[PDB]
């Protein structure tokens, strides 16, 4: 009924980065050169709450920057969908100024009031590393069926305060946030062509290609018809296995965990932004975004001009 336009996207990373030899990893045993090559991480960022960095403060900065750059009035936002892998949130801005560590509420209701989204329906979803894809699909359905004209999507990862820095797992994940705006695009070329999810903790390289294959099949396209690919960033060898599994060449996707780490639900949107800002992805390109939760999801997008801010 309506076409879905991915209008703008932005990210906000922590100001402080940590090297693989940073003293914070002094208690981590059995680290090796092969370990860093295996996971492909060289440096990572952790929020510093003492300086005001948390899952909320940086989303406000990114959301306010995106709305200002995209010339979007706050009252014109019809829906706000937020995701956060951490069950703990820590800041509610001026809405609930006295509330600190909390299990509930989540972010959407508080964030909409902080930004003045007086007409926006708030929603908080959880699908782990696939949360960004889930939120884009929810937004797409609302826009497709004429139930919304502007949808603001948020993913915010503040996991560093839960990491056990006596374990090697603490060297893999990092903090970050991403904000994106989807709008009705009947007159423009951008639209969501198709999406797919498949089921079969799970490292099997084939499960993501299966989802990608179904999405292309639903859209009536093949891998050759796709211009660029955007994957989740669990490890270089998995991303490569996904690419080869679907026929994508090394020149048709990026590996971005090197400077950010594995940002769970933010790695995908961050990778999409990087490809756009670096000229890798350009107007008119048809791209595939794929990742895994236990679920696996893929989406085929016909992109127009996307505002990176």
């Amino acid at each position: 009924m309506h076409k879905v336009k991915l209008a703008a996207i932005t990210c906000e990373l922590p100001a402080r980065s940590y090297e693989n030899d940073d003293p914070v990893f002094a208690a981590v045993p059995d680290l090796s050169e092969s370990w860093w090559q295996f996971w492909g991480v060289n440096r990572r960022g952790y929020f510093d709450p003492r300086n005001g960095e948390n899952e909320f403060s940086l989303v406000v900065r990114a959301a306010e920057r995106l709305l200002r750059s995209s010339d979007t009035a706050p009252d014109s936002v019809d829906m706000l969908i937020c995701s956060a892998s951490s069950p703990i949130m820590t800041d509610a801005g001026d809405v609930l100024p006295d509330l600190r560590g909390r299990l509930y509420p989540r972010m959407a209701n508080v964030l909409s009031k902080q930004l003045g989204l007086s007409r926006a329906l708030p929603l908080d979803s959880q699908m782990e590393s696939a949360s960004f894809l889930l939120n884009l699909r929810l937004a797409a359905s609302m826009i497709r069926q004429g139930k919304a004209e502007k949808v603001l999507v948020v993913c915010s990862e503040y996991i560093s305060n839960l990491l056990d820095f006596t374990s090697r797992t603490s060297t893999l994940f990092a903090d970050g946030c991403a904000v994106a705006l989807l709008t009705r695009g009947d007159d423009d070329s951008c639209d969501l062509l198709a999406s797919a999810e498949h089921s079969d903790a799970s490292f099997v390289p084939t499960n993501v290609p299966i989802a990608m294959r179904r999405a292309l099949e639903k859209a009536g396209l093949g891998s050759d018809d796709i211009d660029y690919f955007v994957f989740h960033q669990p490890a270089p060898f998995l991303v490569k296995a996904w690419a080869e599994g679907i026929g994508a060449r090394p020149e048709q996707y990026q590996l971005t965990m090197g400077d950010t780490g594995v940002m769970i639900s933010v790695s995908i949107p961050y990778t999409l932004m990087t490809g756009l800002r670096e000229g890798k992805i350009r107007p008119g390109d048809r791209i595939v975004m794929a990742g895994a939760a236990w679920g696996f999801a893929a989406q085929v997008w016909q992109l127009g001009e996307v505002l990176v801010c």
Partner: protein, 275 residues
């Protein structure tokens, strides 16, 4: 959104709390886990509709309880899929959303994806949450299972509470327990300030909101015991008995109205009901 069948399973133990927001509500005991009640509630709904777990296209969960969900010391949608055998089902969670809002969003997504058998579940096992002893607010425990068929024509509205329009109702929050030292400690605390006019304000919101829709029979939630017989209320789980009473009356359409204590609003969604 068509309601194919409804399953419900509540603990038999009721716990009474005094205060303006108090009442007598079901409460899980000891080391009871949510899945012990959610699973039979789901199986009940699947049997009524004659739907196999392999036929479930989507599972969406709603649960505030931070623990006592499954044996493994976590969202509810995935462990349910494992025990059901819904190997073809997709899973995600909508956290602190109301049921009405979740049914609207799911109805939009699922109809747009072409799914035919969607499972929306609501559950609580709040042993890990300290009640608000000042106001008497507590969550009702139990499990609700809604087996749905999406249509995309469900209407939705979000309305304010009643009472003085200049009055700012103080919302529910669940602060984290900052001193968790040993096994058995709560993970959080229920915080909903004592507001004696709030239970009536919510019911006044229901009435005002229903004006935004055609004149439909209701299935509504009751989170507070004030003015209720014996002070007993089942929170969102009140919907079960009302939905089955609507099926006996051969009703084809209904309005489901939820109360969201986090946003301090009421939310309604229109639904169809199978015979």
């Amino acid at each position: 959104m068509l309601i194919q069948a409804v399953g419900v399973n509540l603990p038999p133990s009721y716990v009474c709390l005094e205060g303006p927001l108090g009442g007598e509500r079901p409460r899980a005991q000891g080391d009871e886990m949510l899945m012990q009640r959610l699973l039979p509630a789901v199986r009940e709904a699947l049997d009524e509709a004659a739907v196999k777990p392999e036929e479930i296209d989507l599972i969406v969960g709603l649960a505030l309880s931070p623990d006592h969900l499954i044996e493994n010391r976590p969202k509810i949608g995935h462990p349910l899929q494992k025990v059901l055998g819904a190997n073809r089902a997709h899973v995600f969670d909508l956290t602190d959303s109301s049921l009405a809002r979740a049914l609207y969003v799911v109805d939009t997504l699922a109809s747009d994806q072409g799914y035919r058998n969607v499972l929306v579940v609501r559950g609580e096992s709040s042993q890990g949450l300290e009640v608000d002893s000042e106001s008497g607010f507590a969550l009702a425990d139990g499990a609700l299972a809604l087996l749905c068929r999406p249509t995309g024509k469900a209407a939705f509205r979000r309305g304010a509470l009643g009472g003085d329009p200049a009055q700012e109702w103080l919302p529910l929050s669940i602060p984290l327990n900052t001193d968790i030292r040993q096994v058995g400690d709560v993970k959080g605390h229920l915080n909903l300030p004592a507001q004696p006019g709030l239970p009536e304000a919510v019911r006044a919101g229901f009435t005002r909101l229903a004006g935004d829709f055609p004149q439909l029979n209701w299935v509504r939630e009751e989170w507070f015991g004030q003015g209720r017989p014996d002070g007993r209320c089942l929170g969102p789980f009140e919907l079960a008995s009302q939905l089955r009473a609507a099926q006996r009356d051969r009703l084809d359409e209904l309005l489901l109205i939820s109360f969201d204590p986090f946003g301090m609003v009421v939310e309604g969604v229109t639904l169809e009901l199978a015979g």
